[PDB]
């Protein structure tokens, strides 16, 4: 799905930017029958929610990130295995915000450590994770319109 990919990139570029980094080494009415997301509102809400999450949990992921110990060698399987652990008690919208914040944080840390190559990898992994693992839940749970109504 192109729009979970779009939410991944928006969220990660906002996190990178907020810490003073960048994506790339030179990147500096409807009608009554219908049905879509709609994006700019999901992206804003995910942003604010990711920021609240980071403000509340100074701690999280240090266990998780040391478990991935991500390098230019890491494959998708290993990321998928660590993220499965954020979802160990099941999925809900809080666990989804923690998943995005985790990806934000591996990104920032990778830039920090000189492994900018990992940014697009993580983004690509997240989009795959979301589409394989989380999408069937999201669609059943009110879709993204519902996440907005809780974290908008």
UniProtKB/Swiss-Prot annotation:
Tagged with keyword ATP-binding: no
Record motif BH1, residues: 85-104
GO CC term, one of those recorded: mitochondrion
Gene Ontology terms describing biological process: apoptotic process; apoptotic process in bone marrow cell; cellular response to alkaloid; cellular response to amino acid stimulus; cellular response to gamma radiation; defense response to virus; dendritic cell apoptotic process; dendritic cell proliferation
Motif position, BH3: 42-56
Single GO molecular function: protein kinase binding
Superkingdom: Eukaryota
Domain notes: The BH4 motif is required for anti-apoptotic activity. The BH1 and BH2 motifs are required for both heterodimerization with other Bcl-2 family members and for repression of cell death.
Quaternary structure and interacting proteins, as annotated: Homodimer. Interacts with BAD. Interacts with PGAM5. Interacts with HEBP2. Interacts with p53/TP53 and BBC3; interaction with BBC3 disrupts the interaction with p53/TP53. Interacts with ATP5F1A and ATP5F1B; the interactions mediate the association of isoform Bcl-X(L) with the mitochondrial membrane ATP synthase F(1)F(0) ATP synthase. Interacts with VDAC1. Interacts with BCL2L11 (via BH3). Interacts with RNF183. Interacts with GIMAP3/IAN4 and GIMAP5/IAN5. Interacts with GIMAP5 and HSPA8/HSC70; the interaction between HSPA8 and BCL2L1 is impaired in the absence of GIMAP5.
Protein name: Bcl-2-like protein 1
Naturally occurring in which organism (per UniProt): Mus musculus
Residues of the full protein shown: 2 to 196 of 233
